[model samples]
Target: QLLHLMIHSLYSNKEIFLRELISNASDAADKLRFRALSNPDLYEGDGELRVRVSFDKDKRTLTISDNGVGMTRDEVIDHLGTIAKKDSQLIGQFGVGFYSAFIVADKVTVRTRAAGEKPENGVFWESAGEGEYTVADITKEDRGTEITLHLREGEDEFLDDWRVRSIISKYSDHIALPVEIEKREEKDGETVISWEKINKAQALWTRNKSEITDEEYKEFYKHIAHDFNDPLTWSHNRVEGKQEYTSLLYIPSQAPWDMWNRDHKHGLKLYVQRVFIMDDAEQFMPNYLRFVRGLIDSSDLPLNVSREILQDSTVTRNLRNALTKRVLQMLEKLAKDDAEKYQTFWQQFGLVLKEGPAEDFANQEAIAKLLRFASTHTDSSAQTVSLEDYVSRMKEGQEKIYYITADSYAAAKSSPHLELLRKKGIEVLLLSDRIDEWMMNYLTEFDGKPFQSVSKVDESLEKLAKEAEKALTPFIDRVKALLGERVKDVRLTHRLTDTPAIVSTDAKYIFELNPDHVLVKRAADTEDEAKFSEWVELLLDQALLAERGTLEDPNLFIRRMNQLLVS
Candidate 1:
């Protein structure tokens, strides 16, 4: 949520626009530097790394130039103005910071020369942020990238030499490279340009814990997260083992704007010994715990720690287990002692945590304890029910943990499938998250009771007698014949008593995948024989639509309805 502020605010004091712009320039250079380590040819022989921040008042522009790794036309085609894939390990960008420029500018123009490309192949990208962005090829002789932000009416304060200088000193003084802001000054009685380095460029994560204050940590987080709120809690630990490491893990107070994007990239910055290896080391952070943000610097890992190494190395395996243990333990401690704070933490990250049990079956029990869900157990709509709480409140005869995953909260609450379950007065967990449908597939059991999807199960509300089934079989067969191959199967069910008929989907996916067709019991009570095939079809279609939503063949259903209606 605070990502926009970080963008418009540059994390926006409005002053930090220069700070974040220059910081991104710094990151671009860093990405090039790391890639250069393995393949020296990527640098293309010119390695004098420097970033320049300049403004053209005549053009109402603020330009930050970097000679560090420029981008290919194809790469920028995927990035700039257009949303890039989160899984992409491109220029180690904050991803959202580039969009923040729209907060300050009317339009942004980016021209780049990919370090290894031909001079005439330089690509140009431009957007007004109102929609419709443009890209083209142009001639360029430079070895890096240059971005120009055309400022809005009152946004010209970011263009000053002193203004940009002080903002850099405060916000990005810790970046690891020299950031030079161009100055207009008097030289030999004529106005001239002077370039002065703005940043202190110290490594913040590597410094001693005693010297770094809470304010420094908070300020540093702003650079990483582009967030305005302070962190809820944080940990800075240095471990000494066979594979020694330093880590800083933070639990943010607010969710980011992209928190719900399950495919969004979320991981700690990774450093090996002292070299910055990757911007976000996704391999170390388990997908469930991706909400965790910070750095993990290892002492023993190779400088060139490729994905292949991380995936196969014994050290990477232990590091993965250790880091997961650390994060899980942190949440456990916070939830145990500080209820209020943990509640805040859970609200921001609870759904993301729900992804854990399925992703990590080895730690399913631990992850299950951390989960909270909306359920029939409470009249309140908040998802505060834990599995442990649900299990403790289970009915004496209830042997299975029951859940119903729906497309929406109202659908889950009002689902006809749960009518019988509710009559027995058995509470079922109501899971409405889109991910919950997939998450439940692997999260089979919690505390020894296997999970049973209410949408898939049958209960004896009408007393299942074989003679009763025998009578309903022909009608069920006829219904299946009309909807041939569309359904899983037809069944005689007491799950529907008051309703004419309701379908229960395959337990596999009631809410995730597109539902196939299925029929339950046929409800004909001495009606004129063969008098109501369309009526029966209407009841079946309407009940199935109400059970979840929509019919795959709404037009055909409409035709069926139109055939019988007003006859």
Candidate 2:
């Protein structure tokens, strides 16, 4: 009764029937491969590990077969006779997958012989999708399973060869093993047919890098990632040493719709030589690189290496190092080859890489080379510049690398913190990406110069000494007395020439001190700590008010500007 209800009630969309069948085919292929690891001669006659699907127009039937771990007569009775395990404890225990055939067929039949079993040990199971099913013994020399679904009325669409082929390509093209479909054509005046392998079962990473064209690489990405766009960049190389491996890595041009979903599955497939091992090889790349799509084929590992071994093995550690370095190198090439395309890629995936330095310290220097930032010296429209570019353009006597973090490039550029630097012709790096703050926690310096945020309350104005300090001391002390407790301190403008005042957080404080109430806390802190001297308070208020569009509250700020203009 429950099986009947589920078959008729659980699914409303008929299209999912195709998806279910493809998933079943994938499972069958997986089971067979797993069994082969323990018993290599399980399917001795079949030279290739593959799954195949074909349609019979006259009989209104569709058949799916695989050289996988088949079952004995009694085992078929125990498995197919019972309902799919509904218990949630087993995430993969959904028994309803087979019953999905009823959506397109009135009857379904399954034939199988366990791998390495005798011919007479084969079994046959049949069902009408009502409340009952039947099983019996059969004879078969093959070591695998085949399923045939007898189409019901109005479900003949699945009987069309093209329709079945399209569905298989959509859902099962990446199924580790090759999926073959029968092809039919007209020869002379008669119809001719033959089986055609739909998927290229080649282990892509193992191919010679020079022989694989860009188009083939892109097609492989579409197969593995289910993504339509060409990769922004890719790397294919072989690593040999304590751990011998080959890897093909890709950085996508556009971020996926689910890029921010923490629970999304990792997409890098893993294989040992030419055999499929695991699909979600999370150990190959760190969480920060979960957006990357590619494969790692290790020559030094066993074909049947378990997930536990992959996770903890020393071989994996070396492979991870090789993979990370290769990815960084690929990105560097992309940036060098086409700056415009690389800029677009950075706009899409830059934030994800911001956490890379902290997660993998050994690769931090290489990752730093991949970093892009907006700076005061660059044109506003061309917002991306590298640290090397910034260093090359550093003004005479400049000792520290200056940067300011804000919510956006426009806001950061218009900030009062840039006033003195702008007047002194000192360029400051503009960081607006949300992850930039988190990145600073791990990235302290570049090219031997320590990174300093101009917004800091006590920023060391390198190159500007006693004279610069004396010029702004009076106003700084006045502001410090006025806004006591609201801010940490008030500092003079060696870094600012045009703007009277700027506020900043201390380097000792974590950039994420109060993420939830950032603007509010900063404002309140400034108000409490620097409210004593009205002139300094007014300048600080002018900066805050300009930032928040609340300048109407500071009448003294307006007066001070007018006085300076007259003088």
Best by lDDT: 1
lDDT of 2 by residue, 335-382 (tens): 899999989988888888888989989988888999888887765835
Q: Per-residue lDDT of 143-205 in model 1, one digit per residue for the tens?
A: 789988999888778777677777767765556677887877877889997788866666677
lDDT of 2: 0.69
Candidate lDDT values, in order: 0.72, 0.69
Minimum summed lDDT over a 10-residue window in model 1 is located at 508-517
Error of 2 at 499 (Å): 3.8
Candidate 2 weakest ten by summed lDDT = 508-517
TM-score of 1: 0.60
- In candidate 2, residue 350 scores what lDDT? 83
